[PDB]
Amino acid sequence: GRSQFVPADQAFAFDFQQNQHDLNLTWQIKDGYYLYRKQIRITPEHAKIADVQLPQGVWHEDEFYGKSEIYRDRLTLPVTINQASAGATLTVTYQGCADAGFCYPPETKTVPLSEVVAN
């Protein structure tokens, strides 16, 4: 596998589904690739979300971040939107790495949040 250079969006396929106050963020993680738990950052703009609890991954060693908690196969992350104005967004930044050696740069996605009136 010399074409082990698969673009970030095929290694770490991101998607989201919102139903009112409930948002689910999902990454399907290609076999031989992993996301760093400590590299995930989620930032609302014109919205208020509950603190996001990242789930328990597995420990793994590499030469970028030393001994790290990582995620394989899939990551499912619920987010609770307490309020969102019209045109609110959520910025989702994450970084992953290939077993084959090389580390991807951090990726940022912007999720358009559907409006949620407080309460």
Side-chain angles (χ1 to χ4, degrees), residues 1 3-119:
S3 75
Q4 248 283 326
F5 208 56
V6 343
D9 286 327
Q10 296 156 40
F12 314 108
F14 175 72
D15 220 321
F16 61 89
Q17 299 94 215
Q18 181 183 348
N19 174 17
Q20 310 305 138
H21 290 264
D22 295 330
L23 181 68
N24 295 322
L25 305 178
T26 287
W27 288 255
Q28 300 187 18
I29 307 163
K30 196 167 173 75
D31 193 38
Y33 296 83
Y34 51 89
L35 294 166
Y36 297 103
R37 169 179 178 163
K38 270 183 178 321
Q39 294 289 313
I40 300 171
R41 312 143 17 170
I42 292 165
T43 305
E45 287 78 53
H46 308 116
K48 304 178 193 185
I49 56 176
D51 282 348
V52 171
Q53 174 68 70
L54 297 175
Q56 177 59 44
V58 296
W59 286 88
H60 182 259
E61 242 277 8
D62 68 40
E63 328 90 308
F64 299 99
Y65 294 113
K67 174 104 108 51
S68 270
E69 190 175 344
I70 66 162
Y71 299 139
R72 298 185 181 268
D73 305 333
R74 185 186 287 254
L75 168 62
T76 295
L77 276 194
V79 172
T80 294
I81 304 163
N82 296 324
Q83 185 272 176
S85 305
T89 58
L90 193 70
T91 298
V92 182
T93 295
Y94 48 96
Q95 185 173 30
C97 192
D99 283 326
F102 57 93
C103 192
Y104 289 81
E107 296 176 59
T108 287
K109 299 296 182 183
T110 298
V111 174
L113 296 174
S114 291
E115 181 175 4
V116 166
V117 180
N119 289 324

Short mmCIF file of all heavy atoms in Angstrom, two decimals, residues 42-110:
data_model
loop_
_atom_site.label_atom_id
_atom_site.label_comp_id
_atom_site.label_asym_id
_atom_site.label_seq_id
_atom_site.Cartn_x
_atom_site.Cartn_y
_atom_site.Cartn_z
N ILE A 42 -14.43 21.43 19.92
CA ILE A 42 -15.76 21.71 19.37
C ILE A 42 -16.13 23.06 19.99
O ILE A 42 -16.12 23.20 21.23
CB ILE A 42 -16.75 20.64 19.79
CG1 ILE A 42 -16.37 19.31 19.09
CG2 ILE A 42 -18.20 21.14 19.56
CD1 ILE A 42 -17.06 18.11 19.71
N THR A 43 -16.43 24.03 19.11
CA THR A 43 -16.64 25.43 19.49
C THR A 43 -17.93 25.97 18.82
O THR A 43 -18.00 26.00 17.60
CB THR A 43 -15.50 26.30 19.00
OG1 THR A 43 -14.25 25.78 19.47
CG2 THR A 43 -15.68 27.77 19.56
N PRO A 44 -18.92 26.36 19.63
CA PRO A 44 -20.18 26.84 19.07
C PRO A 44 -20.03 28.30 18.72
O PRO A 44 -19.23 29.01 19.39
CB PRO A 44 -21.19 26.65 20.22
CG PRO A 44 -20.34 26.92 21.48
CD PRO A 44 -18.95 26.29 21.12
N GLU A 45 -20.78 28.75 17.69
CA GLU A 45 -20.83 30.16 17.40
C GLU A 45 -22.30 30.56 17.38
O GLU A 45 -23.03 30.01 16.54
CB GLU A 45 -20.24 30.42 16.01
CG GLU A 45 -18.69 30.30 15.86
CD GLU A 45 -18.13 28.87 15.77
OE1 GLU A 45 -18.59 28.05 14.92
OE2 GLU A 45 -17.15 28.61 16.53
N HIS A 46 -22.71 31.53 18.23
CA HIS A 46 -24.17 31.92 18.36
C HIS A 46 -25.02 30.74 18.79
O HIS A 46 -26.18 30.61 18.43
CB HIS A 46 -24.70 32.55 17.05
CG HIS A 46 -23.84 33.67 16.54
ND1 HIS A 46 -23.16 33.60 15.34
CD2 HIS A 46 -23.45 34.82 17.13
CE1 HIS A 46 -22.44 34.70 15.19
NE2 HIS A 46 -22.61 35.46 16.26
N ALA A 47 -24.42 29.82 19.56
CA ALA A 47 -25.18 28.74 20.16
C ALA A 47 -24.59 28.40 21.54
O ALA A 47 -23.44 28.76 21.84
CB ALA A 47 -25.22 27.48 19.25
N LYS A 48 -25.40 27.76 22.37
CA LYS A 48 -24.92 27.31 23.68
C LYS A 48 -25.08 25.79 23.70
O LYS A 48 -26.18 25.29 23.53
CB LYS A 48 -25.75 27.97 24.80
CG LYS A 48 -25.79 29.56 24.77
CD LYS A 48 -26.68 30.09 25.91
CE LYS A 48 -27.03 31.54 25.81
NZ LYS A 48 -27.81 31.90 27.09
N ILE A 49 -23.98 25.06 23.91
CA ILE A 49 -24.05 23.59 24.02
C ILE A 49 -23.62 23.13 25.44
O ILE A 49 -22.84 23.84 26.08
CB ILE A 49 -23.10 22.93 23.01
CG1 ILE A 49 -21.67 23.43 23.19
CG2 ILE A 49 -23.56 23.29 21.56
CD1 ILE A 49 -20.68 22.64 22.20
N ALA A 50 -24.02 21.93 25.85
CA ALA A 50 -23.54 21.39 27.12
C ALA A 50 -22.07 21.01 26.90
O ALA A 50 -21.61 20.79 25.75
CB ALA A 50 -24.40 20.15 27.52
N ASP A 51 -21.31 20.93 27.98
CA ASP A 51 -19.93 20.44 27.85
C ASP A 51 -19.95 19.08 27.17
O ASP A 51 -20.80 18.26 27.45
CB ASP A 51 -19.33 20.30 29.25
CG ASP A 51 -18.90 21.67 29.82
OD1 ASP A 51 -18.88 22.70 29.03
OD2 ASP A 51 -18.62 21.70 31.02
N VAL A 52 -19.00 18.85 26.29
CA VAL A 52 -19.01 17.55 25.53
C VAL A 52 -18.08 16.55 26.24
O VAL A 52 -16.95 16.89 26.60
CB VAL A 52 -18.61 17.79 24.04
CG1 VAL A 52 -18.41 16.46 23.32
CG2 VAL A 52 -19.76 18.54 23.32
N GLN A 53 -18.58 15.36 26.56
CA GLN A 53 -17.75 14.38 27.19
C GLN A 53 -17.23 13.45 26.11
O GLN A 53 -18.01 12.75 25.42
CB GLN A 53 -18.55 13.55 28.23
CG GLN A 53 -17.70 12.35 28.83
CD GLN A 53 -16.53 12.80 29.70
OE1 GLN A 53 -16.75 13.33 30.80
NE2 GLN A 53 -15.27 12.62 29.21
N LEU A 54 -15.91 13.46 25.93
CA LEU A 54 -15.34 12.54 24.95
C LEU A 54 -15.33 11.10 25.54
O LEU A 54 -15.08 10.91 26.74
CB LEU A 54 -13.95 13.00 24.57
CG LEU A 54 -13.88 14.39 23.88
CD1 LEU A 54 -12.42 14.80 23.67
CD2 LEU A 54 -14.65 14.33 22.55
N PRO A 55 -15.65 10.08 24.71
CA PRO A 55 -15.70 8.70 25.27
C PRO A 55 -14.33 8.06 25.44
O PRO A 55 -13.31 8.61 24.97
CB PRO A 55 -16.53 7.93 24.21
CG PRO A 55 -16.01 8.65 22.86
CD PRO A 55 -16.02 10.13 23.28
N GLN A 56 -14.29 6.93 26.16
CA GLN A 56 -13.02 6.24 26.47
C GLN A 56 -12.52 5.49 25.22
O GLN A 56 -13.26 4.64 24.67
CB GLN A 56 -13.27 5.23 27.59
CG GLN A 56 -12.00 4.41 27.92
CD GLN A 56 -10.82 5.25 28.34
OE1 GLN A 56 -10.98 6.18 29.13
NE2 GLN A 56 -9.61 4.90 27.86
N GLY A 57 -11.32 5.84 24.75
CA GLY A 57 -10.71 5.18 23.59
C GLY A 57 -9.69 4.17 24.05
O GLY A 57 -9.75 3.71 25.20
N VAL A 58 -8.71 3.85 23.19
CA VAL A 58 -7.61 2.91 23.59
C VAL A 58 -6.27 3.61 23.64
O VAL A 58 -6.13 4.67 23.02
CB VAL A 58 -7.57 1.71 22.64
CG1 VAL A 58 -8.91 0.89 22.78
CG2 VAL A 58 -7.37 2.15 21.18
N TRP A 59 -5.29 3.07 24.38
CA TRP A 59 -3.99 3.77 24.47
C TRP A 59 -3.04 3.24 23.37
O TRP A 59 -3.08 2.04 23.00
CB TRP A 59 -3.44 3.61 25.90
CG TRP A 59 -4.22 4.49 26.81
CD1 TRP A 59 -5.39 4.17 27.48
CD2 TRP A 59 -3.94 5.87 27.11
NE1 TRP A 59 -5.84 5.28 28.18
CE2 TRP A 59 -4.98 6.33 27.98
CE3 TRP A 59 -2.93 6.76 26.73
CZ2 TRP A 59 -5.01 7.63 28.50
CZ3 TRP A 59 -2.95 8.08 27.26
CH2 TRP A 59 -4.00 8.49 28.12
N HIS A 60 -2.22 4.13 22.81
CA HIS A 60 -1.40 3.74 21.67
C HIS A 60 -0.19 4.64 21.65
O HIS A 60 -0.26 5.76 22.10
CB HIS A 60 -2.17 3.98 20.37
CG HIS A 60 -1.42 3.56 19.14
ND1 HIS A 60 -0.75 4.45 18.33
CD2 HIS A 60 -1.26 2.34 18.58
CE1 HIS A 60 -0.22 3.79 17.31
NE2 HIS A 60 -0.52 2.51 17.43
N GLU A 61 0.91 4.13 21.13
CA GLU A 61 2.11 4.91 21.19
C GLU A 61 2.52 5.30 19.80
O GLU A 61 2.49 4.45 18.91
CB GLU A 61 3.21 4.04 21.80
CG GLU A 61 3.69 4.63 23.06
CD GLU A 61 4.75 5.73 22.84
OE1 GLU A 61 5.02 6.15 21.68
OE2 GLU A 61 5.34 6.16 23.86
N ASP A 62 2.86 6.57 19.62
CA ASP A 62 3.57 7.03 18.41
C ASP A 62 4.56 8.17 18.70
O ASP A 62 4.63 8.69 19.81
CB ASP A 62 2.61 7.38 17.26
CG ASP A 62 1.74 8.64 17.55
OD1 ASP A 62 2.25 9.67 18.12
OD2 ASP A 62 0.56 8.60 17.12
N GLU A 63 5.30 8.59 17.68
CA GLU A 63 6.35 9.61 17.87
C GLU A 63 5.90 11.10 17.67
O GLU A 63 6.73 12.03 17.67
CB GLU A 63 7.53 9.23 16.96
CG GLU A 63 7.73 7.67 16.75
CD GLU A 63 6.97 7.02 15.52
OE1 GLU A 63 5.69 7.20 15.34
OE2 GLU A 63 7.72 6.30 14.75
N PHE A 64 4.58 11.32 17.54
CA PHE A 64 4.02 12.68 17.42
C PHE A 64 3.58 13.16 18.77
O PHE A 64 3.96 14.28 19.20
CB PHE A 64 2.86 12.69 16.41
CG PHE A 64 3.29 12.28 15.04
CD1 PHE A 64 3.07 10.95 14.58
CD2 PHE A 64 4.01 13.17 14.22
CE1 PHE A 64 3.50 10.55 13.33
CE2 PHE A 64 4.44 12.77 12.94
CZ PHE A 64 4.19 11.49 12.49
N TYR A 65 2.83 12.30 19.45
CA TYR A 65 2.24 12.67 20.73
C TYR A 65 2.55 11.69 21.88
O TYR A 65 1.96 11.81 22.98
CB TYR A 65 0.71 12.84 20.58
CG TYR A 65 0.30 14.00 19.70
CD1 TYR A 65 -0.33 13.78 18.48
CD2 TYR A 65 0.59 15.33 20.09
CE1 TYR A 65 -0.70 14.86 17.68
CE2 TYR A 65 0.25 16.42 19.26
CZ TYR A 65 -0.42 16.17 18.08
OH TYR A 65 -0.77 17.27 17.27
N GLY A 66 3.47 10.74 21.66
CA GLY A 66 3.91 9.83 22.77
C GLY A 66 2.80 8.83 23.06
O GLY A 66 2.15 8.32 22.13
N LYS A 67 2.55 8.54 24.33
CA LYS A 67 1.46 7.59 24.65
C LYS A 67 0.16 8.39 24.66
O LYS A 67 0.05 9.41 25.38
CB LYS A 67 1.66 6.82 25.97
CG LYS A 67 0.45 5.94 26.33
CD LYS A 67 0.66 4.43 26.06
CE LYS A 67 0.82 3.68 27.37
NZ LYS A 67 -0.31 4.03 28.30
N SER A 68 -0.81 8.00 23.80
CA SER A 68 -2.01 8.83 23.54
C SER A 68 -3.24 7.99 23.59
O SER A 68 -3.20 6.85 23.18
CB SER A 68 -1.98 9.36 22.06
OG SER A 68 -1.30 10.58 22.08
N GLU A 69 -4.35 8.59 24.01
CA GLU A 69 -5.61 7.91 23.83
C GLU A 69 -6.16 8.20 22.46
O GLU A 69 -6.25 9.36 22.06
CB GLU A 69 -6.57 8.38 24.94
CG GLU A 69 -7.86 7.58 25.04
CD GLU A 69 -8.70 8.01 26.22
OE1 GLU A 69 -8.18 8.71 27.14
OE2 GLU A 69 -9.92 7.71 26.22
N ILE A 70 -6.51 7.13 21.72
CA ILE A 70 -6.93 7.22 20.34
C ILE A 70 -8.24 6.48 20.10
O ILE A 70 -8.70 5.72 20.98
CB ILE A 70 -5.86 6.65 19.40
CG1 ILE A 70 -5.68 5.08 19.60
CG2 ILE A 70 -4.54 7.38 19.66
CD1 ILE A 70 -4.97 4.37 18.42
N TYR A 71 -8.84 6.77 18.94
CA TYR A 71 -10.09 6.18 18.55
C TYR A 71 -9.91 5.46 17.19
O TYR A 71 -9.33 6.02 16.26
CB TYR A 71 -11.15 7.25 18.41
CG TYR A 71 -11.46 8.05 19.67
CD1 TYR A 71 -11.66 9.47 19.60
CD2 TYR A 71 -11.65 7.42 20.89
CE1 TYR A 71 -12.06 10.21 20.75
CE2 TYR A 71 -12.00 8.15 22.05
CZ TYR A 71 -12.23 9.53 21.97
OH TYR A 71 -12.59 10.22 23.12
N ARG A 72 -10.43 4.24 17.08
CA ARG A 72 -10.44 3.54 15.79
C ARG A 72 -11.86 3.17 15.43
O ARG A 72 -12.74 3.28 16.32
CB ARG A 72 -9.63 2.26 15.88
CG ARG A 72 -8.15 2.52 16.21
CD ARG A 72 -7.38 1.21 16.17
NE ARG A 72 -5.95 1.38 16.50
CZ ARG A 72 -5.00 1.59 15.59
NH1 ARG A 72 -5.30 1.66 14.31
NH2 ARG A 72 -3.71 1.67 15.97
N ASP A 73 -12.03 2.74 14.15
CA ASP A 73 -13.28 2.18 13.59
C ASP A 73 -14.39 3.24 13.39
O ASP A 73 -14.81 3.49 12.28
CB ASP A 73 -13.82 1.02 14.46
CG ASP A 73 -12.80 -0.10 14.70
OD1 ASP A 73 -11.90 -0.26 13.82
OD2 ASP A 73 -12.86 -0.76 15.79
N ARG A 74 -14.85 3.82 14.50
CA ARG A 74 -15.82 4.88 14.51
C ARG A 74 -15.75 5.66 15.78
O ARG A 74 -15.35 5.12 16.84
CB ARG A 74 -17.23 4.27 14.40
CG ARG A 74 -18.35 5.31 14.28
CD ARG A 74 -19.71 4.60 14.33
NE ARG A 74 -19.86 3.93 13.07
CZ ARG A 74 -20.66 4.32 12.09
NH1 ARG A 74 -21.51 5.35 12.25
NH2 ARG A 74 -20.63 3.64 10.96
N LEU A 75 -16.09 6.95 15.69
CA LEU A 75 -16.29 7.76 16.90
C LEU A 75 -17.71 8.32 16.76
O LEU A 75 -18.06 8.89 15.74
CB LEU A 75 -15.26 8.92 16.96
CG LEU A 75 -15.54 10.00 18.02
CD1 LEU A 75 -15.53 9.40 19.46
CD2 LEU A 75 -14.51 11.15 17.90
N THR A 76 -18.51 8.15 17.82
CA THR A 76 -19.87 8.66 17.91
C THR A 76 -19.81 9.65 19.08
O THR A 76 -19.37 9.30 20.20
CB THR A 76 -20.87 7.50 18.22
OG1 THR A 76 -20.89 6.57 17.13
CG2 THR A 76 -22.32 8.07 18.51
N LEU A 77 -20.20 10.90 18.85
CA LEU A 77 -20.18 11.93 19.88
C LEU A 77 -21.50 12.71 19.89
O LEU A 77 -21.76 13.49 18.97
CB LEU A 77 -19.06 12.94 19.62
CG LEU A 77 -17.58 12.82 20.00
CD1 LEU A 77 -16.92 14.20 19.86
CD2 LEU A 77 -17.38 12.29 21.44
N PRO A 78 -22.32 12.53 20.94
CA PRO A 78 -23.53 13.35 21.11
C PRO A 78 -23.19 14.74 21.61
O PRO A 78 -22.22 14.94 22.37
CB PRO A 78 -24.36 12.57 22.13
CG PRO A 78 -23.36 11.74 22.93
CD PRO A 78 -22.22 11.44 21.95
N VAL A 79 -23.95 15.72 21.16
CA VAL A 79 -23.77 17.09 21.62
C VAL A 79 -25.17 17.63 21.94
O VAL A 79 -26.13 17.35 21.22
CB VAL A 79 -23.10 17.97 20.51
CG1 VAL A 79 -23.09 19.46 20.90
CG2 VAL A 79 -21.65 17.44 20.14
N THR A 80 -25.31 18.30 23.07
CA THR A 80 -26.62 18.81 23.42
C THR A 80 -26.62 20.30 23.14
O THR A 80 -25.77 21.03 23.65
CB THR A 80 -26.98 18.54 24.92
OG1 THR A 80 -27.10 17.13 25.12
CG2 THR A 80 -28.33 19.20 25.24
N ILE A 81 -27.52 20.72 22.27
CA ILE A 81 -27.62 22.16 21.91
C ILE A 81 -28.71 22.74 22.83
O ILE A 81 -29.89 22.45 22.64
CB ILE A 81 -28.05 22.33 20.43
CG1 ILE A 81 -27.08 21.60 19.46
CG2 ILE A 81 -28.29 23.83 20.05
CD1 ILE A 81 -27.69 21.41 18.07
N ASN A 82 -28.32 23.58 23.79
CA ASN A 82 -29.32 24.23 24.66
C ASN A 82 -30.02 25.38 23.94
O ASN A 82 -31.21 25.61 24.12
CB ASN A 82 -28.69 24.70 25.96
CG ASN A 82 -28.16 23.54 26.80
OD1 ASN A 82 -28.77 22.48 26.82
ND2 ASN A 82 -27.02 23.71 27.44
N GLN A 83 -29.28 26.10 23.12
CA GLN A 83 -29.86 27.19 22.34
C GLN A 83 -28.98 27.34 21.11
O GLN A 83 -27.75 27.10 21.19
CB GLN A 83 -29.89 28.49 23.17
CG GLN A 83 -30.61 29.71 22.48
CD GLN A 83 -29.66 30.57 21.57
OE1 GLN A 83 -30.10 31.53 20.89
NE2 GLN A 83 -28.36 30.23 21.58
N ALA A 84 -29.60 27.79 20.01
CA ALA A 84 -28.87 28.16 18.82
C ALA A 84 -29.69 29.21 18.11
O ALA A 84 -30.88 28.97 17.85
CB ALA A 84 -28.77 26.93 17.92
N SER A 85 -29.07 30.33 17.76
CA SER A 85 -29.78 31.37 16.94
C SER A 85 -29.78 30.96 15.47
O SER A 85 -29.19 29.93 15.10
CB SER A 85 -29.12 32.72 17.12
OG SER A 85 -29.07 32.98 18.48
N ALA A 86 -30.51 31.70 14.63
CA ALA A 86 -30.56 31.33 13.22
C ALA A 86 -29.17 31.62 12.62
O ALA A 86 -28.65 32.75 12.75
CB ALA A 86 -31.60 32.20 12.51
N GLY A 87 -28.62 30.64 11.90
CA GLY A 87 -27.26 30.81 11.28
C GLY A 87 -26.13 30.42 12.22
O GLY A 87 -24.95 30.63 11.88
N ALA A 88 -26.46 29.92 13.43
CA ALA A 88 -25.43 29.36 14.33
C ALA A 88 -24.66 28.22 13.68
O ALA A 88 -25.16 27.50 12.76
CB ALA A 88 -26.08 28.84 15.68
N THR A 89 -23.42 28.10 14.16
CA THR A 89 -22.53 27.02 13.65
C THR A 89 -21.78 26.34 14.78
O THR A 89 -21.74 26.85 15.88
CB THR A 89 -21.50 27.56 12.61
OG1 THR A 89 -20.73 28.60 13.19
CG2 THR A 89 -22.23 28.06 11.35
N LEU A 90 -21.23 25.16 14.47
CA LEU A 90 -20.37 24.50 15.41
C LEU A 90 -19.12 24.20 14.61
O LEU A 90 -19.17 23.61 13.53
CB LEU A 90 -21.05 23.20 15.86
CG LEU A 90 -20.46 22.51 17.08
CD1 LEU A 90 -20.73 23.31 18.36
CD2 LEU A 90 -21.09 21.09 17.18
N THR A 91 -17.98 24.63 15.17
CA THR A 91 -16.70 24.33 14.52
C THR A 91 -16.14 23.05 15.17
O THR A 91 -16.02 22.98 16.38
CB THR A 91 -15.75 25.52 14.77
OG1 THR A 91 -16.31 26.70 14.17
CG2 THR A 91 -14.41 25.26 14.21
N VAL A 92 -15.80 22.08 14.33
CA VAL A 92 -15.36 20.76 14.80
C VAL A 92 -13.97 20.53 14.23
O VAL A 92 -13.82 20.42 13.01
CB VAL A 92 -16.37 19.68 14.36
CG1 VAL A 92 -15.95 18.27 14.90
CG2 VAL A 92 -17.85 20.09 14.90
N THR A 93 -12.97 20.47 15.11
CA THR A 93 -11.56 20.31 14.68
C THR A 93 -11.03 19.03 15.29
O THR A 93 -11.42 18.66 16.40
CB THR A 93 -10.74 21.53 15.17
OG1 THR A 93 -11.23 22.72 14.51
CG2 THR A 93 -9.21 21.35 14.95
N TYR A 94 -10.22 18.29 14.52
CA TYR A 94 -9.78 17.00 14.98
C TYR A 94 -8.50 16.67 14.23
O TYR A 94 -8.18 17.28 13.18
CB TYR A 94 -10.87 15.88 14.74
CG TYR A 94 -11.44 15.89 13.35
CD1 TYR A 94 -10.94 15.04 12.34
CD2 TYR A 94 -12.52 16.75 13.05
CE1 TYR A 94 -11.49 15.05 11.02
CE2 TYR A 94 -13.10 16.78 11.75
CZ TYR A 94 -12.60 15.90 10.76
OH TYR A 94 -13.18 15.95 9.52
N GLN A 95 -7.73 15.72 14.77
CA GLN A 95 -6.55 15.30 14.03
C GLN A 95 -6.40 13.79 14.12
O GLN A 95 -6.64 13.18 15.17
CB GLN A 95 -5.30 15.92 14.66
CG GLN A 95 -4.00 15.61 13.83
CD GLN A 95 -2.85 16.40 14.39
OE1 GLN A 95 -2.83 16.69 15.60
NE2 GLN A 95 -1.90 16.79 13.51
N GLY A 96 -5.94 13.20 13.02
CA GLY A 96 -5.65 11.79 13.07
C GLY A 96 -4.32 11.42 12.42
O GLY A 96 -3.57 12.29 11.95
N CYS A 97 -4.06 10.13 12.43
CA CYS A 97 -2.75 9.58 12.09
C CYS A 97 -2.90 8.21 11.45
O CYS A 97 -3.90 7.53 11.65
CB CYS A 97 -1.92 9.48 13.37
SG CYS A 97 -0.05 9.13 13.10
N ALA A 98 -1.95 7.81 10.60
CA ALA A 98 -1.99 6.48 9.97
C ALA A 98 -1.04 5.54 10.69
O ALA A 98 0.08 5.94 11.08
CB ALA A 98 -1.58 6.56 8.46
N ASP A 99 -1.46 4.28 10.85
CA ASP A 99 -0.58 3.23 11.38
C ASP A 99 0.70 3.14 10.55
O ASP A 99 1.79 2.88 11.09
CB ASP A 99 -1.30 1.88 11.40
CG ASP A 99 -2.29 1.79 12.58
OD1 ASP A 99 -2.00 2.37 13.65
OD2 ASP A 99 -3.33 1.16 12.44
N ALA A 100 0.54 3.39 9.26
CA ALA A 100 1.66 3.30 8.29
C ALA A 100 2.76 4.32 8.50
O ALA A 100 3.82 4.22 7.84
CB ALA A 100 1.12 3.39 6.90
N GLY A 101 2.54 5.29 9.40
CA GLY A 101 3.59 6.14 9.91
C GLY A 101 3.23 7.60 10.09
O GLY A 101 3.53 8.22 11.16
N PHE A 102 2.54 8.15 9.09
CA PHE A 102 2.47 9.57 8.89
C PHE A 102 1.26 10.18 9.60
O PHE A 102 0.21 9.53 9.70
CB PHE A 102 2.39 9.85 7.43
CG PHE A 102 1.24 9.18 6.72
CD1 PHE A 102 0.03 9.84 6.55
CD2 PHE A 102 1.40 7.89 6.16
CE1 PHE A 102 -1.03 9.23 5.85
CE2 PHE A 102 0.35 7.28 5.46
CZ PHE A 102 -0.86 7.96 5.30
N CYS A 103 1.40 11.45 10.00
CA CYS A 103 0.38 12.13 10.77
C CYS A 103 -0.32 13.12 9.88
O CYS A 103 0.36 13.82 9.12
CB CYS A 103 1.02 12.91 11.94
SG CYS A 103 -0.24 13.49 13.17
N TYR A 104 -1.66 13.17 9.91
CA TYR A 104 -2.37 14.20 9.16
C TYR A 104 -2.37 15.55 9.89
O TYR A 104 -2.28 15.60 11.13
CB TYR A 104 -3.84 13.80 8.95
CG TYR A 104 -4.00 12.68 7.98
CD1 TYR A 104 -3.80 11.36 8.37
CD2 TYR A 104 -4.43 12.94 6.68
CE1 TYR A 104 -4.01 10.31 7.47
CE2 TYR A 104 -4.65 11.90 5.78
CZ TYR A 104 -4.42 10.59 6.17
OH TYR A 104 -4.62 9.57 5.26
N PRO A 105 -2.47 16.66 9.13
CA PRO A 105 -2.67 17.95 9.78
C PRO A 105 -4.11 17.98 10.37
O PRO A 105 -4.97 17.19 9.88
CB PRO A 105 -2.46 18.97 8.64
CG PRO A 105 -2.95 18.21 7.40
CD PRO A 105 -2.63 16.73 7.65
N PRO A 106 -4.37 18.86 11.37
CA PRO A 106 -5.73 18.98 11.95
C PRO A 106 -6.71 19.40 10.87
O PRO A 106 -6.32 20.10 9.89
CB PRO A 106 -5.56 20.07 13.02
CG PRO A 106 -4.08 20.12 13.29
CD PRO A 106 -3.42 19.81 11.99
N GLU A 107 -7.94 18.93 10.98
CA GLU A 107 -9.00 19.24 9.98
C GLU A 107 -10.05 19.99 10.71
O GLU A 107 -10.25 19.72 11.91
CB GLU A 107 -9.64 17.99 9.53
CG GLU A 107 -8.63 17.16 8.82
CD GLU A 107 -9.19 15.86 8.44
OE1 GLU A 107 -10.22 15.88 7.69
OE2 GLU A 107 -8.57 14.85 8.88
N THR A 108 -10.74 20.90 10.01
CA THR A 108 -11.79 21.65 10.67
C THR A 108 -13.01 21.55 9.77
O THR A 108 -12.91 21.76 8.56
CB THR A 108 -11.42 23.18 10.94
OG1 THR A 108 -10.47 23.25 12.00
CG2 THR A 108 -12.63 23.93 11.46
N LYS A 109 -14.15 21.24 10.37
CA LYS A 109 -15.41 21.25 9.69
C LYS A 109 -16.34 22.27 10.40
O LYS A 109 -16.28 22.46 11.62
CB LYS A 109 -16.05 19.88 9.75
CG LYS A 109 -15.24 18.71 9.08
CD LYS A 109 -15.07 18.91 7.55
CE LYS A 109 -14.28 17.70 6.94
NZ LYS A 109 -14.06 17.95 5.46
N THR A 110 -17.23 22.88 9.61
CA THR A 110 -18.21 23.79 10.19
C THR A 110 -19.56 23.16 9.95
O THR A 110 -19.96 22.93 8.80
CB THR A 110 -18.14 25.16 9.52
OG1 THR A 110 -16.84 25.70 9.74
CG2 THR A 110 -19.23 26.12 10.07
#
